[PDB]
Motif scaffolding. Structure first.
Motif, PDB file in Angstrom:
ATOM      1  N   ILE A 134       0.464  -1.187  -0.089  1.00  0.00           N
ATOM      2  CA  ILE A 134      -0.068  -0.049   0.092  1.00  0.00           C
ATOM      3  C   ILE A 134       0.807   1.363   0.177  1.00  0.00           C
ATOM      4  O   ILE A 134       0.684   2.046  -0.892  1.00  0.00           O
ATOM      5  CB  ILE A 134      -0.986  -0.005   1.125  1.00  0.00           C
ATOM      6  N   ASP A 135       1.789   1.588   1.035  1.00  0.00           N
ATOM      7  CA  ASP A 135       2.561   2.730   0.881  1.00  0.00           C
ATOM      8  C   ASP A 135       4.130   2.303   1.135  1.00  0.00           C
ATOM      9  O   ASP A 135       4.601   2.950   1.778  1.00  0.00           O
ATOM     10  CB  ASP A 135       2.197   3.552   2.449  1.00  0.00           C
ATOM     11  N   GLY A 136       4.399   1.303   0.618  1.00  0.00           N
ATOM     12  CA  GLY A 136       5.671   0.709   0.635  1.00  0.00           C
ATOM     13  C   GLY A 136       6.390   0.427   1.935  1.00  0.00           C
ATOM     14  O   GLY A 136       7.625   0.240   1.754  1.00  0.00           O
ATOM     15  N   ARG A 137       5.625   0.317   2.935  1.00  0.00           N
ATOM     16  CA  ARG A 137       5.981  -0.202   4.309  1.00  0.00           C
ATOM     17  C   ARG A 137       5.409  -1.284   4.876  1.00  0.00           C
ATOM     18  O   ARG A 137       4.211  -1.587   4.876  1.00  0.00           O
ATOM     19  CB  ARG A 137       6.115   1.101   4.974  1.00  0.00           C
ATOM     20  N   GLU A 138       6.200  -2.176   5.256  1.00  0.00           N
ATOM     21  CA  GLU A 138       5.588  -3.351   5.988  1.00  0.00           C
ATOM     22  C   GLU A 138       5.180  -2.805   7.384  1.00  0.00           C
ATOM     23  O   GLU A 138       5.639  -2.114   8.022  1.00  0.00           O
ATOM     24  CB  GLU A 138       6.523  -4.322   6.045  1.00  0.00           C
ATOM     25  N   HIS A 139       3.851  -3.562   7.961  1.00  0.00           N
ATOM     26  CA  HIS A 139       3.456  -3.221   9.008  1.00  0.00           C
ATOM     27  C   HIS A 139       3.142  -4.340   9.696  1.00  0.00           C
ATOM     28  O   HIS A 139       3.224  -5.341   9.353  1.00  0.00           O
ATOM     29  CB  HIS A 139       1.697  -2.428   8.804  1.00  0.00           C
ATOM     30  N   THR A 140       3.298  -4.076  11.156  1.00  0.00           N
ATOM     31  CA  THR A 140       3.466  -5.170  12.241  1.00  0.00           C
ATOM     32  C   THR A 140       1.964  -5.593  12.398  1.00  0.00           C
ATOM     33  O   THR A 140       1.158  -4.878  11.950  1.00  0.00           O
ATOM     34  CB  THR A 140       3.981  -4.820  13.435  1.00  0.00           C
ATOM     35  N   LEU A 141       1.599  -6.824  13.007  1.00  0.00           N
ATOM     36  CA  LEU A 141       0.421  -7.278  13.278  1.00  0.00           C
ATOM     37  C   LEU A 141      -0.347  -6.163  14.070  1.00  0.00           C
ATOM     38  O   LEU A 141      -1.688  -5.966  13.896  1.00  0.00           O
ATOM     39  CB  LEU A 141       0.394  -8.681  13.974  1.00  0.00           C
ATOM     40  N   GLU A 142       0.351  -5.658  14.949  1.00  0.00           N
ATOM     41  CA  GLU A 142      -0.483  -4.494  15.867  1.00  0.00           C
ATOM     42  C   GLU A 142      -0.897  -3.506  15.205  1.00  0.00           C
ATOM     43  O   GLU A 142      -1.662  -2.738  15.425  1.00  0.00           O
ATOM     44  CB  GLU A 142       0.697  -4.423  16.918  1.00  0.00           C
ATOM     45  N   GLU A 143       0.280  -2.931  14.297  1.00  0.00           N
ATOM     46  CA  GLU A 143      -0.093  -1.694  13.479  1.00  0.00           C
ATOM     47  C   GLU A 143      -1.324  -1.876  12.754  1.00  0.00           C
ATOM     48  O   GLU A 143      -2.078  -0.972  12.668  1.00  0.00           O
ATOM     49  CB  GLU A 143       0.994  -1.043  12.596  1.00  0.00           C
ATOM     50  N   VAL A 144      -1.460  -3.089  12.163  1.00  0.00           N
ATOM     51  CA  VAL A 144      -2.561  -3.443  11.407  1.00  0.00           C
ATOM     52  C   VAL A 144      -3.847  -3.662  12.033  1.00  0.00           C
ATOM     53  O   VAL A 144      -5.037  -3.236  11.935  1.00  0.00           O
ATOM     54  CB  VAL A 144      -2.236  -4.594  10.519  1.00  0.00           C
ATOM     55  N   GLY A 145      -3.705  -4.105  13.326  1.00  0.00           N
ATOM     56  CA  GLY A 145      -4.929  -4.415  14.092  1.00  0.00           C
ATOM     57  C   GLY A 145      -5.529  -3.034  14.759  1.00  0.00           C
ATOM     58  O   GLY A 145      -6.591  -2.691  14.580  1.00  0.00           O
ATOM     59  N   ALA A 146      -4.423  -2.245  15.250  1.00  0.00           N
ATOM     60  CA  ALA A 146      -4.744  -0.689  15.415  1.00  0.00           C
ATOM     61  C   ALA A 146      -5.463   0.137  14.457  1.00  0.00           C
ATOM     62  O   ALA A 146      -6.445   0.752  14.716  1.00  0.00           O
ATOM     63  CB  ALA A 146      -4.032   0.023  16.368  1.00  0.00           C
ATOM     64  N   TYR A 147      -4.978  -0.217  13.374  1.00  0.00           N
ATOM     65  CA  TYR A 147      -5.633   0.658  11.905  1.00  0.00           C
ATOM     66  C   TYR A 147      -6.889   0.275  11.863  1.00  0.00           C
ATOM     67  O   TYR A 147      -7.800   1.206  11.620  1.00  0.00           O
ATOM     68  CB  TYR A 147      -4.589   0.029  10.782  1.00  0.00           C
ATOM     69  N   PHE A 148      -7.135  -1.012  11.947  1.00  0.00           N
ATOM     70  CA  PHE A 148      -8.724  -1.394  11.675  1.00  0.00           C
ATOM     71  C   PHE A 148      -9.537  -1.414  12.991  1.00  0.00           C
ATOM     72  O   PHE A 148     -10.694  -1.983  12.901  1.00  0.00           O
ATOM     73  CB  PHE A 148      -8.864  -2.714  10.727  1.00  0.00           C
ATOM     74  N   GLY A 149      -8.985  -1.470  14.145  1.00  0.00           N
ATOM     75  CA  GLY A 149      -9.514  -1.683  15.293  1.00  0.00           C
ATOM     76  C   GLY A 149      -9.844  -3.041  15.612  1.00  0.00           C
ATOM     77  O   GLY A 149     -11.031  -3.547  16.066  1.00  0.00           O
ATOM     78  N   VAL A 150      -8.846  -3.940  15.387  1.00  0.00           N
ATOM     79  CA  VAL A 150      -9.141  -5.471  15.766  1.00  0.00           C
ATOM     80  C   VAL A 150      -7.707  -6.094  16.461  1.00  0.00           C
ATOM     81  O   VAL A 150      -6.968  -5.486  16.296  1.00  0.00           O
ATOM     82  CB  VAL A 150      -9.426  -6.424  14.414  1.00  0.00           C
ATOM     83  N   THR A 151      -7.965  -7.275  16.992  1.00  0.00           N
ATOM     84  CA  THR A 151      -6.843  -7.737  17.591  1.00  0.00           C
ATOM     85  C   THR A 151      -5.630  -8.218  16.581  1.00  0.00           C
ATOM     86  O   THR A 151      -5.756  -8.532  15.610  1.00  0.00           O
ATOM     87  CB  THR A 151      -7.363  -8.892  18.647  1.00  0.00           C
ATOM     88  N   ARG A 152      -4.541  -8.416  17.504  1.00  0.00           N
ATOM     89  CA  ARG A 152      -3.326  -8.816  16.641  1.00  0.00           C
ATOM     90  C   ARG A 152      -3.671  -9.950  16.087  1.00  0.00           C
ATOM     91  O   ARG A 152      -3.259 -10.580  14.972  1.00  0.00           O
ATOM     92  CB  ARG A 152      -2.284  -8.665  17.709  1.00  0.00           C
TER      93      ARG A 152
END
Length: 61
Positions: A24-42
């Motif tokens: 998406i933005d050329g950067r890898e996201h952690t499971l936590e970053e993605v979870g917080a992004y959508f508002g769901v658990t790691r």
């Protein structure tokens, strides 16, 4: 890769994968970053990612 596999991926799966893998933005996201992004658990994100990856493995056959 376009589709023919990425096509079988749901909207949540394709989005989780792209964000996680840097597509998406050329950067890898952690499971936590993605979870917080959508508002769901790691763990929920890990589950969606693992399923997306299994689906890609299937349609590569």
């Amino acid at each position: 890769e376009l589709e023919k596999a990425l096509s079988k991926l749901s909207e949540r799966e394709a989005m989780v994968l792209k964000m996680r893998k840097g597509l998406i933005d050329g950067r890898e996201h952690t499971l936590e970053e993605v979870g917080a992004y959508f508002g769901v658990t790691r763990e929920r994100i890990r589950q969606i990612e693992n399923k997306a990856l299994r689906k890609l493995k299937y349609h590569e056959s």
